[PDB]
Amino acid sequence: SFLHIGDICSLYAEGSTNGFISTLGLVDDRCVVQPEAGDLNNPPKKFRDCLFKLCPMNRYSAQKQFWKADAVLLNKLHHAADLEKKQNETENRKLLGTVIQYGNVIQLLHLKSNKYLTVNKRLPALLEKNAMRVTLDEAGNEGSWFYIQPFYKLRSIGDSVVIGDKVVLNPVNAGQPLHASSHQLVDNPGCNEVNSVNCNTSWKIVLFMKWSDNKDDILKGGDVVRLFHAEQEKFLTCDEHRKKQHVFLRTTSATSATSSKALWEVEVVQHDPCRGGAGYWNSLFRFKHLATGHYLAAVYSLVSVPEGNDISSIFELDPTTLRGGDSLVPRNSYVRLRHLCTNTWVHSTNIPIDKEEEKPVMLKIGTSPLKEEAFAIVPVSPAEVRDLDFANDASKVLGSIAGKLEKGTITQNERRSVTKLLEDLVYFVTKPNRERQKLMREQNILKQIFKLLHICRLCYRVLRHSQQDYRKNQEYIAKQFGFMQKQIGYDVLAEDTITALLHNNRKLLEKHITAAEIDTFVSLVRKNREPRFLDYLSDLCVSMNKSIPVTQELICKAVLNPTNADILIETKLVLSRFEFEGVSTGENALEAGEDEEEVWLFWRDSNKEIRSKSVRELAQDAKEGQKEDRDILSYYRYQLNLFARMCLDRQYLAINEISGQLDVDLILRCMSDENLPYDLRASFCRLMLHMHVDSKDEIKERFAQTMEFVEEYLRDVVCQRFPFSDKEKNKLTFEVVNLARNLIYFGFYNFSDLLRLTKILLAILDCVHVPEKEDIMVMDTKLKIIEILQFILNVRLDYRISCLLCIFKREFDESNSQSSGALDFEHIEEQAEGIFGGSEENTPLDLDDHGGRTFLRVLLHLTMHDYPPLVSGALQLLFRHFSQRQEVLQAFKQVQLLVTSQDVDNYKQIKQDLDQLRSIVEKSELWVYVKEILIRLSKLCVQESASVRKSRKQQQRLLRNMGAHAVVLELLQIPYEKAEDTKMQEIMRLAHEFLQNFCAGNQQNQALLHKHINLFLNPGILEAVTMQHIFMNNFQLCSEINERVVQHFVHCIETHGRNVQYIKFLQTIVKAEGKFIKKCQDMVMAELVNSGEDVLVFYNDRASFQTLIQMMRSERDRMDENSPLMYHIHLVELLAVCTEGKNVYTEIKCNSLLPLDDIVRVVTHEDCIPEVKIAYINFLNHCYVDTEVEMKEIYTSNHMWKLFENFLVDICRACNNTSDRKHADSILEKYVTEIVMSIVTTFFSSPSRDYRNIIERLQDIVSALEDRLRPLVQAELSVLVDVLHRPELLFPENTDARRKCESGGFICKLIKHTKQLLEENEEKLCIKVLQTLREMMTKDRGMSLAEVQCHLDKEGASNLVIDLIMNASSDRVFHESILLAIALLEGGNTTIQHSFFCRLTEDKKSEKFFKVFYDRMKVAQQEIKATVTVNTSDLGNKKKDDEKAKDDLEMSAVITIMQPILRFLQLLCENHNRDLQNFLRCQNNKTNYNLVCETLQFLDCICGSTTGGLGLLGLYINEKNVALINQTLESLTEYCQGPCHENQNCIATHESNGIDIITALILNDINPLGKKRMDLVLELKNNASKLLLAIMESRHDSENAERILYNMRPKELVEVIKKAYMQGEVEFEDGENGEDGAASPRNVGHNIYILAHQLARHNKELQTMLKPGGQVDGDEALEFYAKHTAQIEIVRLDRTMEQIVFPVPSICEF
């Protein structure tokens, strides 16, 4: 039965063993067949095990000589094999869609298990009395080729026998026909086994899919996919609920890793149960829960279904999109499904399949009759498939085996296969591949192992392999731990667990063992004589918490010290034991090693813990110092002297000035050490170095010893070979180098000499010069770079340069004063007392309580003061306090810290504890809603809470606010404190500062708010304040204005209903709640009062206002009255923002009365504070109410008292009498009168020592402004010295025997693209930016496009593009600067730049996803950032006439701030303009989300409101808008400059607005005349000239209308051409030959051009057109002074691209 090769077939024995193939599981590997499973008419269930591809054998002898069996010999053997494959694979490729002849024997390989069927002649087959065994080998063998002879007399060998045939395809090698046998097995009973013999039975190929049909890209018959409710971001997911089937979408990671259940098996309808066929459109399809077996069926909801033979199950998927082509669907495609038996498009169902359990993820879902949606097929890795199944059958073997071994001795072949697994498994671990770690504990392996109740360590190795980042699995071995000792008896295998642990697993490990360690160390020191098991334990010593158990151990080791051998003399026979070991001897010299090894780790296991160690550490004896032995002893002895706590003596503008001076070198090393993880990059910064060129006493005695061993390491650096000798010398050095670094640093000193010591360090770090196995080797060099460019750094960064600063004292203006925050040294003496305060502990009873008392006060007394620079050394004082706080005294010392006057800079540093601080809020929240951790955890909480937007952002509360709100709430929802001390509201409420209102930047709050236990309700009552906490807090979580949930949210739970309880009984609750009862309760009337305010927009929406219609305002009358209101008059400006949200959106929902009067008696009955706040709430009131007019007129009989109240709130006095407290007076009148020109617009659409401090301050501002300004430029030229770059390594570093002097750039380039892998690029990235803008400047600040393209030649445009996307996190606040620099050099040479894109488009996929981002940077700048400065501007200064200008002081600094985000978007415009050229470029490739529309909508967003003559005015008349908009008209204009039909059509359309706005501005092009108007004329026109022309340079009909209809055109264009041509022609005092501007005349001329061009087609344009088209009237003969003095004509076109378009006008108009 014939079938092109690579077809897909099954095949089935008939006769006496009528059956077909069957699989052996993945652990067990043996052929068989359950005749009891199915028919040919009735196919078996488990089908995929029995189908496979039409296999041509493949040539492969090379695996086989190679497999029979310097490397070399076998390397060539194995490479032959690999190749052997290749030709097997290219050859075999040739054998595809190839009808194999019968007797064209064809290999056979096992698609599901993926294994070549194998024929084993020499090994006997067991079950047959004397046959040969048949079994699968993936790699295969030669037996594989099964002779394709045929079975029945009709067919024959050499012929492609037909479609479904018996055949006799026997192996010429097994030599037997393929034997089928009645016999059957005992372990997995279904089956009768399989092997070749001269037997008698008969199979017919039962085809599956076809040859051809094996195209991959289309989801094919039985192909994998994942069933995302994409809208629910939720692969549906049907957990077998309650030991039954639940069918349920899972808690929504669009292509991320889901657990196994996410996927499902695929089937397509075929006339035979068994062939299947090619995915297609008219084909329906049906699917099964492979994990379950049962197929989930729609009792009309998606459910489950044990057997897929019923038809209700099936579903028809209309493609989402219409196919141009053949109907075959494609893989991972997406489409809407109507369950076809149900003939009904299933709808996601909002209810849950578990629901009783709090916050549950299994969810109802089912068939929906209604038509209106689709979800993406997510095709899946067949490989991924194969692995999980191995893990299954593995599991199955493993648990089966467990049952045997626990149960009894299993048999020994069992052992073989099960080891062969065990092996095969450890083998499965074989280096980054996190998925594999998942599958196993996920696939009944992990358990099955532990189950199976050293030879044990094969599992154990399999085990600590995955060990990494895996917290939950670690506790099961508490008990098991003792076993290491008994298994340490067996082998050292169990140690690596304890250490892979130790490293990654720190902390939680520390808890359980306790003095249990004492018995595996007594056991082990008694049983490990070389004590190596013991030793892996000592290396485990990590963390401060270790030192303790460590030391008690020392006591028992004092019992253990005996050793029956000698270490002594003290000097003589140690140095002798060292010459004797110095003989490489065996036996004896052998043993010595242990001790030295033993000695080194544990002794350094000592952290910043000396004393017991500085007491253990006697004789700083160091001579035969050996491997840092000596060094850790001058290091623990250095712990005995001078925790060099910080540095940082001073601050103020000084610091920066110098850092400028350091120039790049500072970078070269900071990038050498701080990046250049890669040796290579650190190293060229070392090229920068070789260029550069130009207890004090008693510690100091140890230090002499030191200074030698360094100069010495330099005469060993005279040895260039740091071959191996540098493993030794380099290690030793290394400890000597952090410790010499650390040696200088604890022991530096303030004169020429630890510095002159640096002068030696020059020749050190220079004398310090300076693949395959070489990376492992390079590790040493690599630590030597963190430590050599740390040593280089720590001395280089802050140590370099402290005297020049104050040396230059001499003096200024007044009289010479060479140096030939007040008493900062009493506060840093009290603060070195802070260090000494570091040192102590709680047992010094004498010292512990008494003396230090509370220095907090100086802290408290100097909090307002500019920070001392050693606050990082003040943060020192903090960190210890992480341990505990039983003693109450905590707080008082602990509070000084809360006293701070610089939160942001610190809070960044304070985030340090974020993990530990989140424990301070989880323990602190375990005891809140000793006291200093809940209160200090809240005082922490607010400092960060009152911070930058990036800071709220840094709450980043996936790790873990759902745990700090959900664990905070797990205890603090039931727990609340009555007024007036209470604090759940605080560590929770500081957090929701989402820019201090409104309802934005709180996206993270639906999911943490989403899994929760609600707050109390109904009868009885609960405790104060945290219900209050509760309500304002609910606002901030569900107040995002962008999603429809907020309505269901401000409703879900509390709903409309809340109102009726805020009528009464909360006063009862608050009176029992506190002494100031009224407080929790006027708080509760605010909380009742504010469901409007937060996402007031997102409250109403599609439909929340209609729901409460007729109830809530009628009810709002009920709480209409109050007083004493200070707090509840905050509930009256919160009942007044509350009260401001009532009538805004009620366009169409009113049938009630008297609401305006209530507020009106309220605002008057007011007493207490100055109206300014209640006259801005009452005034804001009168503007919102006066604006609506005719609706307000329907609402009541009259509002006459509201014009006198509006005129008395608007009229007032100096406060309303004489307060005299404001001074930006033209701002206020000003905005108020174009918000009253705005309001005017709204009404028709109606329906001895301090002198040291100060003269120092002054010489610092004068020398400051002088020095800093002048100096930066020459540094920019010397920066430009690196810009020789390629020529610089050739000068001097002239690089002989071909060394690579030129072209240094391209390499450094890739290097830094990798360096930003560090989350902090910091100034480093920015420092790069500066020089690029100065590389435009080799052509400028002094060819530049061979430099622009030179980079682009030597790694260019590509690296920087690929790099611009990290600007999200790193670089948001330089992404602006970054952008500018990139555009400059490139601009003017898009030749270069095409290459850029030319390289870019390639990564088609890797390019395509990325396109959306900038658009949401604009877009994301776009809609918000219009709102921000634009409308406050719109109220434009001062809309009152002209002949104390008081123009608001300092408006410009501010506007510069608001358009910082805007300005990002803006330079963005200029560059978009500069790079563009070819159309493909302009085309915005088939990206994910590439809508030029966003340009039209940000363009359209400050525009926004401006239908007529343009009267944002203010915002129009506002300046930053203009640069932005013109370059958006030149970017936008280079985009339409290509006049793509679909671009011009697209633009006016998708903005649907931007366009029209463009039209209306020029028809009142500015009302404010002047220099600002003049520019408004040139841009308003030349940008409009160019752009309008570009969009209109085409012929269709559809693209012209959307724009012409915008203008009263003939009259707007002809009265604007007579008012602009007239306003413009009349003066004629302009500058001549203005290459530069011609404004009103090449612009107005551009209107004559526009009018001109519209005359291709239509009739309304002939209508505008006959007034140029004729006449003798003056304005049509001025309009004739154009047609003759405008060109009024168009040029001859050969037609570009493909002989296409016709014409457009070219200026030539004398």
Curated annotation (Swiss-Prot):
What outcome is documented for mutating residue 153 to A in this protein? Reduces calcium flux by about 50%
Q: What is the effect of changing residue 50 to A?
A: Strongly reduced palmitoylation
This protein's UniProt keywords: Apoptosis, ATP-binding, Calcium, Calcium channel, Calcium transport, Cytoplasm, Cytoplasmic vesicle, Disulfide bond, Endoplasmic reticulum, Ion channel, Ion transport, Isopeptide bond, Ligand-gated ion channel, Lipoprotein, Membrane, Metal-binding, Nucleotide-binding, Palmitate, Phosphoprotein, Receptor, Repeat, Transmembrane, Transmembrane helix, Transport, Ubl conjugation, Zinc
Q: Name one GO biological process term.
A: post-embryonic development
Q: How does it sit in the membrane?
A: Multi-pass membrane protein
Origin superkingdom: Eukaryota
Q: Where is the lipid attached (S-palmitoyl cysteine)?
A: 50, 719
Q: Please outline how this chain is modified post-translation.
A: Polyubiquitinated. Polyubiquitination targets ITPR1 for proteasomal degradation. Approximately 40% of the ITPR1-associated ubiquitin is monoubiquitin, and polyubiquitins are both 'Lys-48'- and 'Lys-63'-linked. Phosphorylation by cAMP kinase (PKA) enhances calcium release. Phosphorylation by PKA increases the interaction with inositol 1,4,5-trisphosphate and decreases the interaction with AHCYL1.
How activity is regulated? Inositol 1,4,5-trisphosphate-gated calcium channel activity is regulated by cytosolic calcium in a biphasic manner, with low concentrations causing activation and higher concentrations inhibiting channel opening, giving rise to calcium oscillations. ATP increases the open probability of ITPR1 by synergizing with the activating effect of these two primarily ligands, inositol 1,4,5-trisphosphate and calcium. Inositol 1,4,5-trisphosphate-gated calcium channel activity is activated by zinc ions.
GO molecular function terms attached to this record:
ATP binding; calcium channel inhibitor activity; inositol 1,4,5 trisphosphate binding; inositol 1,4,5-trisphosphate receptor activity involved in regulation of postsynaptic cytosolic calcium levels; inositol 1,4,5-trisphosphate-gated calcium channel activity; intracellularly gated calcium channel activity; metal ion binding; phosphatidylinositol binding
Residues noted as binding Ca(2+) 2 in the record, renumbered to the chain: 1470, 1534
- Record bears the keyword Transcription regulation: no
- The question of whether Isomerase is a record keyword is answered with no
Glycyl lysine isopeptide (Lys-Gly) (interchain with G-Cter in ubiquitin) cross-link, renumbered residues: 773, 1438-1440, 1611
Domain MIR stretches = 97-151, 158-208, 216-269, 326-380
Subcellular locations according to the entry:
Endoplasmic reticulum membrane; Cytoplasmic vesicle, Secretory vesicle membrane; Cytoplasm, Perinuclear region
Effect after changing residue 470 to A/F: Abolishes inositol 1,4,5-triphosphate binding
Annotated positions binding 1D-myo-inositol 1,4,5-trisphosphate: 250, 252, 438, 441, 470-471
Summarize the subunit comment.
Answer: Homodimer. Homotetramer. Interacts with ERP44 in a pH-, redox state- and calcium-dependent manner which results in the inhibition the calcium channel activity. The strength of this interaction inversely correlates with calcium concentration. Part of cGMP kinase signaling complex at least composed of ACTA2/alpha-actin, CNN1/calponin H1, PLN/phospholamban, PRKG1 and ITPR1. Interacts with IRAG1. Interacts with CABP1 (via N-terminus). Interacts with TESPA1.
Recorded domain comment: The ITPR1 structure has a large solenoid CY assembly built around the central helical bundle made of the C-terminal domains from four ITPR1 subunits. The solenoid scaffold includes domains responsible for binding of ligands and regulatory proteins and is connected via an allosteric nexus at the cytosolic-membrane interface to the transmembrane channel assembly. Six transmembrane helices from each subunit form the central ion-conduction pore.
Family indicated by similarity: Belongs to the InsP3 receptor family.
The protein's name = Inositol 1,4,5-trisphosphate-gated calcium channel ITPR1
Its source organism is Mus musculus
Whole protein: which stretch is covered?
A: 7 to 2217 of 2749
